[PDB]
Amino acid sequence: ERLLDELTLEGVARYMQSERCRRVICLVGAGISTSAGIPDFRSPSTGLYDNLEKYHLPPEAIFEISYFKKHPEPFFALAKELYPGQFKPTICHYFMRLLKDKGLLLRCYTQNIDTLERIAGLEQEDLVEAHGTFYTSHCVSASCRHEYPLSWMKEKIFSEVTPKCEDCQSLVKPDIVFFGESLPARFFSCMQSDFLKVDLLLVMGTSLQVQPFASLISKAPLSTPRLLINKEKAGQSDPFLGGGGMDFDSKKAYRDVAWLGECDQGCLALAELLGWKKELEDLVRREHASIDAQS
């Protein structure tokens, strides 16, 4: 006997509204922000890195910290080119805000750097930004580390002035984790505590191909149901590489459910099952109108 009465979205919703389900961890990737216009920065099939010759570069050096600290100009020129015209979180982001409102959100682990989780109303304590964030920036000198807000960094990016610390004139870097940098200590300390406590893993908009983030699904207790909302099935064991892997379809499947489609539409469907459609619609329309009215 398993926790889901059937391996479907309808089964998951019944489980969430049972007393057995109290603490939900969300694992989210670039798929939850493409609807807001944010490209997948890890995908070479998004045309982001087609115009890098102008930067007279050696490709991956654009995001390697060693290269950045010596030649920061290419990164900041790219950042200007790609800076979003607007920061409007998606239906998926506000669904997690509703999970928070209803006392169900234990933690959201995000691969994204775009700050939309914070704009949607998740708080720092709710979030593990596994790859950092553009939300804040810091001087890179170890004896300084002066912090700067996005408004300050934005103004440097758009005026094409390489950002420098006002106290010490070292370079100032967005708090994203470049290649070559340590991953955040908070990612590991939170994982060791949260996965002792999780009742449901909600995995949305990630293909689960980037480590160590993808290994989080194997940290769940064996009984914990795992729902994937994503355009493509993901997280199954690799027939070549072979283990915590997802099992949606075998005769041994017992807890993993795949809902295949756009993340906004899957979150809409789950909310409707939960009785939350009107609440979710009202929240999105209100926050979107507010952002659109920013003067």
Partner: peptide
């Protein structure tokens, strides 16, 4: 602490 690598 582990460093960030491709993939």
């Amino acid at each position: 602490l582990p460093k960030k690598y491709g993939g």
